[PDB]
Amino acid sequence: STEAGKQHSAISWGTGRAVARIPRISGSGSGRNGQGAFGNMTRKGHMFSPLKNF
Amino acid sequence: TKGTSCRGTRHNKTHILCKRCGKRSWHLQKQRCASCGYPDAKMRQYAWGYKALRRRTQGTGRMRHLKIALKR
Amino acid sequence: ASLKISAIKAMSKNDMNAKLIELKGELANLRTAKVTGGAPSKISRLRVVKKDIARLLTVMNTQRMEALRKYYKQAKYVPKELRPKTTRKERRQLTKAQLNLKTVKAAKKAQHFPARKFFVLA
Amino acid sequence: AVSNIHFCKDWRSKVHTWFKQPFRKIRRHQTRVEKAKAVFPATIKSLKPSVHCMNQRFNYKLRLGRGFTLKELRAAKIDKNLARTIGIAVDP
Amino acid sequence: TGHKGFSYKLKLGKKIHQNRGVPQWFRMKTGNTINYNFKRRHWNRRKMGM
RNA sequence: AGAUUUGAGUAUCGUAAGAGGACUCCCUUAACUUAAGCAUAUCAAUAAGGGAAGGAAGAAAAAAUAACAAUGAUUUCUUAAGUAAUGGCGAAUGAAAAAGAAAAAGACCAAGUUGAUA
RNA sequence: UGGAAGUAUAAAUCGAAAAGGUGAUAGUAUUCAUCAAAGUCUAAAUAUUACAGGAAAACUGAUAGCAAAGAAGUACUGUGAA
RNA sequence: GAUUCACGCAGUGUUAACGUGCAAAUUACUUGUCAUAUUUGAGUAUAGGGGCGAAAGACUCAUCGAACUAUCUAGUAGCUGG
RNA sequence: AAGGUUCCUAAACAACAUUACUUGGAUUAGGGUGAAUCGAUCCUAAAUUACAGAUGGAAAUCCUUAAGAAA
RNA sequence: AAUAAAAUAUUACUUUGGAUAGUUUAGUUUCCUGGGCGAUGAAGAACGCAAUGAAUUGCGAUAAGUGAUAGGAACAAUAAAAUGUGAAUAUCCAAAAUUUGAAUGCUUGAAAGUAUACUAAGGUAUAUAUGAUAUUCAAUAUCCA
């Protein structure tokens, strides 16, 4: 899917928070919030260069 | 006192349940619904809110009559 | 479900009414029994009775509507409930006659110069 | 070699793939057969002139044109009103 | 509040009605996975926000 | 008083609204980005905003090409072609006739004429 | 706009015709060629990642594949958009 | 728009307590103030190159020398890490 | 105001109230809110929003009795 | 100099954990056919309905279902009743279809309501703009006795 793994509004928290700079899911209230984001190596994110039907 | 202490007086609702969409998004003072865009005749939908489209649209409900017609 | 379509159909209109009050009254007393600790046989009777009322009301309404269609079959101003079943788009479309309408010039030319039947020898 | 590649715009929305090509043959061939069964004279692809190509690069070649002029029908003794009914193309 | 609109009170009553567990007989059905109602709430745990 | 003109109220029979918008026709003067800076340019009819449609829509019958041993409505595909041209002539942008196919279809108003006029 | 002494649209002003437009280097003249604007309609060949129904696959096989293989846009968070 | 005490309120000092706290700013004593430029409830109005400010770039939902949220957007990185 | 069944009773203590609990605002099942006179409903305040009209490329904005054969 | 309590190392068994292997009623992509909503009230929302239901599913005061036509002997967690004189099950059909929603008599905040007319209670119609026809009017606007 073209939008697979890119369906979040995540932004990196930046430095100064003792965590890596990989983007993080926004909001709160669930376990998903504050987790990894679109990045290739993250869970539930897009993979390396996605396979295209063309 | 911008943190714990200031939250003591939060006892006045800003939004109440809307009548067209059923969500607690009817602004009392603004007299409009922030979610479904009440009295505005058209349902409030934005292309930047692609997820908000897939949460309430055709086929997300009962489809009481349309299901008969399309099958017809 | 014990009322039988055959029994309902034979009954007259007043009998259908008088049977409906009896069934509604019979149902009302069965609701009291269930609340007041009724027997399972009574409770199963309550479910059965509810179907007769639905069964009885269908036949009265269906016969009344069918009689109305016979009235308005020749009527010029048919009520919208008795009009043929279509969609909103279908009603607005031009009639098949209107679509196939042609002017006298174009209709008369097509009469004198139709599409002939032929083939090429090879 | 100096590269001139026009991919700065969003080509991904400009990409057209031909996965329907093997099914255009089946569609067009079947429709082409269906017309023949309906009125076989219709699919005859009505007769067309023999006109030269334009420009001096092609002017020695002949190709089918569209429609016979009203003078060519008169020369061949065919009515222009009846010509269209018997599979002749007419181009006034 | 002691004072409420009629429609609001009925929506309160439904939330009370929906705060119930699975009946025992439904739990004995063959191939049954619905043992507990995960939509349950209590007044002091989660505010229903209405 | 009567003959007209214009504008309203009411009654009857209908009509528009809202949903959807993947594809279709449009309105509007975004920026990030590239130019190893940047201000024209690029990104770019692109994002967001707004309107209108159908099973397809748009276009369509020359005030069109060409300079030929000439073609001939529209649409779509191949080629022309990263070419002519545009551009702080920098970065970059960029067609069309000819030619080869799919399909093929042409008809109307206005103006003019006939007025024991309809 | 590729259209370069203006390819297209719009606005302000001006504004034709015993017709005239075009031949993309502005200008005047004489020939030549080719069309006849300022109203309307028109099937077929073409597009489609809405949605519905089907069939396939050198696709993934529960941290993978749609966010969702269970009452998933559900539990839960926010006044709210989300 | 005098001096003080009280119900209350603030936050001068201890630069006391606590500082993985009772608390994402609180506690104890001391201090000041405690009705007319007073304190306070509900309703209502003002919105982001905007509002509001007895003015500190202060406040605008623990976010303000330009809020929150989503799209452009996987923005660019001659720089760091793998 | 806000909360929403936390109210009352009975059975019961696996989890929860930084030990424990026979207790509980915790689990399970029932019961419980009675108006001509109290309030909402009625009136208007700050303010708010319509048809028509005016403005705008558009979404929409202005106007609240002024512009209207309206009110 | 001595101890092996702790410490360390190997293997077997058990434990906390859920990797690995086997598997799929789920997804992704392409393609074919359609692209069939609404004032005859849609999409969406809300409330209600099962003998024991909280969600979910289906449905609308005829309620997890009614009639008709096919269909031929079941359902089940536990009882009941019905059932070859027709149980399940299926549907572009018939009747029926609560409060709302473009929402359209007026009002609507979480609002309870309410006006007139036609046929006490019930049910219908009455929003805005607009085309045709009918009828009643307004303006010396043009003539005009």
Side-chain angles (χ1 to χ4, degrees), chain D residues 5 9 16 26-27 32 34 36 41 43 46 48 50 57-58 68-71 79 84 86:
Chain D
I5 286 175
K9 288 143 105 139
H16 190 359
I26 311 164
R27 262 177 211 133
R32 202 199 44 71
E34 288 173 13
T43 180
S46 46
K48 289 164 166 52
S50 193
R57 169 176 169 163
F58 302 109
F68 296 91
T69 81
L70 314 181
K71 285 191 186 178
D79 199 304
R84 293 239 188 83
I86 52 187

Side-chain angles (χ1 to χ4, degrees), chain D residues 23-50:
Chain D
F23 307 87
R24 268 182 233 125
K25 285 195 185 179
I26 311 164
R27 262 177 211 133
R28 278 147 147 166
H29 166 59
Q30 175 57 32
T31 309
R32 202 199 44 71
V33 167
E34 288 173 13
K35 278 176 192 177
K37 278 189 168 178
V39 192
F40 213 106
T43 180
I44 297 203
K45 283 197 167 300
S46 46
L47 183 81
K48 289 164 166 52
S50 193

Side-chain angles (χ1 to χ4, degrees), chain D residues 65-80:
Chain D
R66 146 186 204 131
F68 296 91
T69 81
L70 314 181
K71 285 191 186 178
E72 283 162 14
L73 303 169
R74 286 164 192 151
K77 269 152 220 301
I78 317 173
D79 199 304
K80 84 170 199 174

Side-chain angles (χ1 to χ4, degrees), chain B residues 17-30:
Chain B
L17 293 183
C18 180
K19 191 199 210 180
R20 190 163 81 181
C21 36
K23 290 176 72 164
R24 190 180 95 173
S25 300
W26 171 266
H27 199 309
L28 282 167
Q29 284 189 260
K30 273 190 204 193

Side-chain angles (χ1 to χ4, degrees), chain A:
Chain A
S1 207
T2 51
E3 281 285 315
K6 308 209 259 148
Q7 291 191 66
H8 300 305
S9 44
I11 44 162
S12 34
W13 286 0
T15 82
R17 300 189 72 155
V19 301
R21 305 187 278 196
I22 181 87
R24 313 242 158 199
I25 313 286
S26 76
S28 34
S30 51
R32 187 80 184 108
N33 307 100
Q35 284 189 353
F38 327 115
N40 152 50
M41 78 299 270
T42 79
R43 174 194 178 265
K44 205 139 277 315
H46 73 69
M47 50 144 188
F48 189 38
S49 148
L51 324 170
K52 312 246 154 293
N53 52 61
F54 58 82

